[PDB]
């Protein structure tokens, strides 16, 4: 029942500061060590540091030992990470992790992880995505399944979330990882296969969401009129 929910991510300015938070539940927060781990683009995990229950011991990754401050509020089952002197290198997904600490058996495992909160340290402005329809290049007569989708292009920073028919449609859906265009803007596609026959009857809507720009778009993909 362990649940770790991060928040506080988003676009930040180089040289600036940012405070990330983590809400925990499903376990006696007061008895566990907590850890922060991040993952920059095209990189692996990187340990930031951890904090024991009574906050009396706080270990940090050699480098960020100073620009990083970890803290917790056992009363509110929360974990905090104070970032400072933000540089592009700090752009990454920040994970809230519970550490099972067993000094008796020298057993130390990062058991449960949150899904992280994205943080982009850029000087650029936040931009919303343009949602274009990838029309079904098929009809009902053809018989079978048709491929259709949405092209979410030119937005910044990551991430955007895409769902179909408010979540009702999930089978056959493929939302590709965003790509960084030369323009410095992100772009991605989300496709899904449905039965040709349903084309014209069933409605297919992709729900795009981009918190950074407070954008929310519902584009209805239909067979292009010939």
């Amino acid at each position: 029942e362990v649940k770790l929910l991060e928040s506080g991510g988003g676009l930040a300015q180089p040289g600036g500061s940012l405070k990330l938070s983590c809400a925990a539940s499903g376990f006696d927060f007061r008895r566990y060590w907590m850890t922060w781990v991040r993952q920059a683009p095209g990189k692996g995990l990187e340990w930031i540091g951890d904090i024991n229950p009574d906050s009396r011991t706080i270990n940090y990754m050699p480098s960020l030992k100073d620009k990083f401050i970890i803290s917790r509020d056992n009363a509110k089952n929360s974990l905090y990470l104070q970032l400072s002197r933000l540089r592009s290198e700090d752009s990454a997904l920040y994970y809230c992790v519970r550490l099972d600490f067993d000094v008796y058996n020298h057993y130390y495992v990062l058991d449960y992880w949150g899904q992280g909160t994205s943080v982009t340290v850029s000087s650029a402005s936040t931009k919303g995505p343009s949602v274009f329809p990838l029309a079904p290049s098929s009809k009902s007569t053809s018989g079978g399944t048709a491929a259709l989708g949405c092209l979410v292009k030119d937005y910044f920073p990551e991430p955007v979330t895409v769902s179909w028919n408010s979540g009702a449609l999930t089978s056959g859906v493929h939302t590709f990882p965003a790509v960084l265009q030369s323009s410095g803007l992100y772009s991605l596609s989300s496709v899904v296969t449905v039965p040709s026959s349903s084309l014209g009857t069933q409605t297919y809507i992709c729900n795009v969401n981009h918190k950074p720009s407070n954008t929310k778009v519902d584009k209805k993909v239909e067979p292009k009129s010939c």
């Binding site: 994970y95 099972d100 058996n105 130390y108 274009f132 092209l151």
Partner: protein
Amino acid sequence: ELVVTQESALTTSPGETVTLTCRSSSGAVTTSNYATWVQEKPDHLFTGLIGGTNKRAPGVPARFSGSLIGDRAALTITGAQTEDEAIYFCALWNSNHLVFGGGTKLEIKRTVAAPSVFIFPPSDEQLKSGTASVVCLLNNFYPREAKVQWKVDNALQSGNSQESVTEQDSKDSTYSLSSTLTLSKADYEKHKVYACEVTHQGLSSPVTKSFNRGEC
């Protein structure tokens, strides 16, 4: 400067046994490094597997085991299952801080599956913006190696397309890829035939999906 290294990728067949290693740049891995493993599944879903080098975490099937092999720490999966497709991260404790490895992408061999190809012409709305994006979709195929070539009126394109690939599907163990050709509205209007040529092991001959601009 400790650097933990792992093989970037490994492929095994179901029921087989595979071993991922973790080595330290400062010497042989030892019990005092408390080698630990984490598994990353699609959508940033991580889960602790091993701790203290060889101790399994609660909820972890016994097919997973840890140990020291030579100068390295290792994770051995016996009877590999398709559900084991993931990225495995290793971490070593270096006296006062934790160091992760680069992770190993574990792939599970399955039978060849040719991709279903689809080509999407740019939308009219997008054209108004002055740009034209042509999308090509390769769906559920295996292995991952697939070559997608763009041809505009039989002119093989280059440097004007980016592609994205999904993680190996947990169910069918396949991959899905998309290639996007981006052109200025101008250039797009300067040509007629837009084709996507796909080459893959599951195809006897390359498959081409295309459309003529304006033709509906």
